[PDB]
Design a protein around this ligand. Structure first.
Ligand SMILES: OC[C@H]1O[C@H](O)[C@H](O)[C@@H](O)[C@@H]1O
Ligand SMILES: [Ca+2]
Length: 771
């Protein structure tokens, strides 16, 4: 490996061999189907709300999130980079697709598949990833750096449906070598959203944009229709000329054939025919190819940038609504702008690289933090783009001030912005994209007094319940299968209108968002204040025994939605205390004296009673009335965690919090698989895992990272990182279960998972305490 020195891959990048098999992979062990797309994954490409494309460590473009809210895992075999190399004065060269695999059927059988093992590496540090190619039959070594411009405090480039592939080629031998790199792409118009004749009308064109000291050559893959529909738009691939390289192309090859129309050209001398052909297809799949060819002398290096863009302006949800995607603000709405996007990328990618470096540097340059922690911190951010992210720039055929936003909780449970989950999962948004975070919370504010008296069947017990109750915060802002932002509470396993955490978590989120953006956004507090008061006031009415605390009802009436709580619970009770303290503080900021006084009185009564009811000398009991009420819950003091973040001080005595955290570390972590897998949710005082519900026996990745944050705030540094380490290990390490770029909600002690691609573990950003 002589190429790694010519490029700048951080030591904290996650790494795996190209073509590596992983032996220990976890699966769901479940009655009903659950997504399991395998361990062959990678860092995604594409901006927020743009639709994303998962290119795997084996090189395939395989995890398609282009249809907003859907996860479709299938390798589009025509989409590849390929290489040709010929040592000068040899009869023949060699051509190889850079993909560690082959097609299942006979399409593209002429191409050279099965990039060999032990011949290159994949590296990831989101939003960047890299491949190196160090192959005994390829004298010139190659690497590519690929990324999209995901940039904190930037709401423009961060939205773009674009990727850059910056190639480096180095000749370590003592012979001249002729080299070509070729990007192939299928015209994917009709891949989704088209009900009949999926390729019909697709056509490809070539754009050559020449100007002083500049040339871009691109293929634009579109359709002859000017229909404004979800399925229609354009893909583009292209390259920018650099000194010493020539460009060749082929406008049209048939993807539903053997591929030799393209491959006989590339494999001969790495130079394509430069044949333009705009003839539209009918049934056959078609694709385009862009290539560069160059001669490398001994010791010579060259760099050449390619790019990919996709202008699919309209997202459609299953309930029928059609919306424009955010990037359309910058490029237009007509779906004929893929070349403009691609050109912006090829003319600005060096600046984008620097902007990414600028935001990663503070963490990377902190040598007190272990590299493993940095691996998880950056790579967990994949989900912000990959989580079905919807970011609208108008309803099709209709203009407001704001752009509504939603991130899915996951794909198995297809709900936008699940509030009980975003309490944990929204840290990257508040810390890095706060204008989005505030928009999401105003969306929740707007829902507080919505009433929907229509009834739905509750999944857990089969009873009927009212959809949305006035004054209760919704569980979620709808589903991609229905009407995001319009029809809320898509979730139906339990009735969220009687949840005891959502209203308090909402208040805590509001105050968090004020505190973590500088304590200056009075307008945001003013916008949300009425909803904050309503939320706490409604929750107060759920106090059935007048101890000043809402009562859990002997059912799963909170985020642990199969784990029953009864009476006063540590979890909902601490959250309530913290939420009252936040509301007092907002009252003071807004000069609402009556509110300050009311919530101060409620707080003092509830705090006193919480302590008496639950403090047992070592930790806080799970609750007052359940069968295993003395279980040690990992999340028992979630309220005090948020209070630390919000700078609200002690809601419980310092000494008692410290003892509780130490007990959680000693038991839920260190007595669960030797502390190598995170914090199990429920442990019995005898040191045996609580078996009363599956959730008690699960580690929740996002709960565990949040707990690590709490420990870190409380000066338990070693316990904090050891607790987080088991999550990193399980996700990323060779000894783990192969969950990279699909971090799940949960695993059990055998390592098998629930709900891959989950929002909650974004909570790792709560560990950026100093920030
Ligand atoms: O795994 C538990 C979780 O399952 C689903 O994501 C529910 O929508 C969520 O509310 C709950 O916390
Ligand atoms: Ca009560």
């Amino acid at each position: 490996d002589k190429i790694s020195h010519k490029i700048d891959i951080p030591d904290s990048a996650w790494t795996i061999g190209i073509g590596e098999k992983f032996k220990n992979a976890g699966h769901p062990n479940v009655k009903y189907p659950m997504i399991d797309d395998s361990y062959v994954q990678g860092a995604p490409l594409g901006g927020f709300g743009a639709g994303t494309i998962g290119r795997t460590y084996n090189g395939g473009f395989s995890r398609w999130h282009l249809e907003i809210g859907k996860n479709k895992y299938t390798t589009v075999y025509a989409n590849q980079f390929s290489v040709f190399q010929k040592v000068e004065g040899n009869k023949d060269g060699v051509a190889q697709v850079l993909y560690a695999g082959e097609p299942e059927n006979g399409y593209l059988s002429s191409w050279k598949w099965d990039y060999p093992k032990e011949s290159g590496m994949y590296y990831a540090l989101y939003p960047n990833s890299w491949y190196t190619y160090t192959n005994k039959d390829l004298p010139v070594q190659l690497a590519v750096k690929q990324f999209s411009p995901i940039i904190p405090y930037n709401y423009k480039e961060t939205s773009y449906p674009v990727a850059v592939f910056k190639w480096t080629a180095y000749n370590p031998t003592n012979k001249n070598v002729d080299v070509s790199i070729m990007f192939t792409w299928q015209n994917m118009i009709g891949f989704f959203g088209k009900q009949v004749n999926v390729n019909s009308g697709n056509f490809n064109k070539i754009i050559k944009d020449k100007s002083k000291d500049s040339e871009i050559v691109a293929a634009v893959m579109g359709n002859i229709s000017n229909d404004n529909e979800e399925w229609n738009g354009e893909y583009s691939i292209g390259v920018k000329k650099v000194p010493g390289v020539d460009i060749s192309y082929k406008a049209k090859f048939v993807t539903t054939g053997d591929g030799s129309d393209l491959w006989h050209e590339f494999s001969k001398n790495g130079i394509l025919d430069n044949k333009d052909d705009e003839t539209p297809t009918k049934q056959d799949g078609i694709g385009s190819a862009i290539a560069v060819n160059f001669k490398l002398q001994p010791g010579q290096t060259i760099e050449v940038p390619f790019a990919l863009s996709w202008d699919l302006p309209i997202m459609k949800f299953g309930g029928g609504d059609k919306w424009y995607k955010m990037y359309t603000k910058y490029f237009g709405k007509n779906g004929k702008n893929s070349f403009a996007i691609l050109k912006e990328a090829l003319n600005n990618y060096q600046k984008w690289e620097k902007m990414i470096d600028d935001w990663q540097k503070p963490i990377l340059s902190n040598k007190s933090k272990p590299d493993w922690y940095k691996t998880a911190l950056f790579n967990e951010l994949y989900y912000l783009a990959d989580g079905g992210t919807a970011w609208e720039n108008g309803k099709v055929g209709e203009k407001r001030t704001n752009n509504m936003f939603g991130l899915l909780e996951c794909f198995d449970y297809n709900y936008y912005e699940t509030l009980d989950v975003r309490f944990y999962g929204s840290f990257p948004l508040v810390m890095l994209w706060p204008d989005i975070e505030k928009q999401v919370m105003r969306q929740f504010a707007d829902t507080i007094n919505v009433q929907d008296s229509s009834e739905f069947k509750v999944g857990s017990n089969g009873a009927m319940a009212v959809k949305k109750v006035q004054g209760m915060i919704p569980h979620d802002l709808g589903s991609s299968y229905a009407l995001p932002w319009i029809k809320i509470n898509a979730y139906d396993w339990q009735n969220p209108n009687i949840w005891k955490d959502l209203n308090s978590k909402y208040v805590l989120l509001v105050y968090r968002d004020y505190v973590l953006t500088g304590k200056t956004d009075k307008e945001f507090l003013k916008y949300t204040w009425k909803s904050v008061k309503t939320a706490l006031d409604k929750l107060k009415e759920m106090d059935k025994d007048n101890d000043g605390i809402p009562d859990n009802e002997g059912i799963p009436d909170q985020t642990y939605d199969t784990w029953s709580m009864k009476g006063t619970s540590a979890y909902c009770g601490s959250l309530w205390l913290a939420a009252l303290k936040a509301a007092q503080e907002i009252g003071k900021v807004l000069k609402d004296n009556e509110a300050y006084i009311k919530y101060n009185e409620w707080y003092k009564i509830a705090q006193q009673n919480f302590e008496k009811e639950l403090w047992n000398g070592e930790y806080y009991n799970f609750d007052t009335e359940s069968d295993h009420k003395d279980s040690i819950m990992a999340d028992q003091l979630a309220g005090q965690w948020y209070a630390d973040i919000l700078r609200l001080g002690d809601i419980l005595p310092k000494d008692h919090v410290q003892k509780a955290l130490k007990k959680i570390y000693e038991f839920n972590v260190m007595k669960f698989e030797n502390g190598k897998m995170g914090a199990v949710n429920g442990m019995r005082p005898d040191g045996i895992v609580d078996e009363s519900d599956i959730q008690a026996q699960e580690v929740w990745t996002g709960v565990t990272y949040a707990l690590a944050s709490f420990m870190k705030y409380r000066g338990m540094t070693e316990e904090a990182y050891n607790t987080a380490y088991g999550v990193y290990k399980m996700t990323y390490d060779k000894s783990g279960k192969g969950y990279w770029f699909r971090t799940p909600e949960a695993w059990t002690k055998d390592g098998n998972y629930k709900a891959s691609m989950y929002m909650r573990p974004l909570s790792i950003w709560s560990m950026e305490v100093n920030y």
